[PDB]
Design a protein around this ligand. Structure first.
Ligand SMILES: C[As](C)(=O)[O-]
Ligand SMILES: C[As](C)(=O)[O-]
Ligand SMILES: [K+]
Ligand SMILES: [K+]
Lengths: 66, 59
DNA sequence: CAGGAGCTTAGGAGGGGGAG
DNA sequence: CTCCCCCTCCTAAGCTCCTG
């Protein structure tokens, strides 16, 4: 019912990108831990990593384009 | 009823109207909404997104 | 309240796995 | 065919900005 589209703050994005640096496919336990730090549901941080891995794929293609 | 999925035949009518006008008024969006059997709300969001996909490919 | 824009999150199809 | 799980590709959609 509620889709506030989970707009991430910079502090939230900071912990996310930190975990994304160590691992791009974190297990559920690694996703719960960062979800508590950023005070967000775990399901939002899994959709984030899914989108974040696409961003990595998009940028390598965008680089080969330019 | 959470997300519209435009078929190939619907995108033909939508991209055709977009060629005539990037910003269509509600009357024109209704005519194409009935052709594609989708609510005019989806037609407005499509053009809002169709203009961003055009400004993206302009650079 | 409308109309726009930029940004990016989030439903959905659909490959693999499990099951009924 | 259905229901979950993983994953990606695709892009409709929600929020926040502007503008009258
Ligand atoms: C975009 As019109 C003038 O056909 O409503
Ligand atoms: C066990 As598998 C990587 O084929 O889902
Ligand atoms: K409104
Ligand atoms: K898999």
């Amino acid at each position: 019912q509620r889709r506030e589209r989970t707009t991430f703050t910079r502090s939230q994005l900071e912990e996310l990108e930190a975990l994304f640096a160590k691992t791009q496919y974190p297990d559920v336990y690694a996703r719960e831990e960062v979800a508590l730090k950023i005070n967000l549901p775990e399901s939002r941080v899994q959709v984030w990593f899914k989108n974040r891995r696409a961003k990595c794929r998009q940028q390598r293609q965008q680089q080969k384009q330019q």
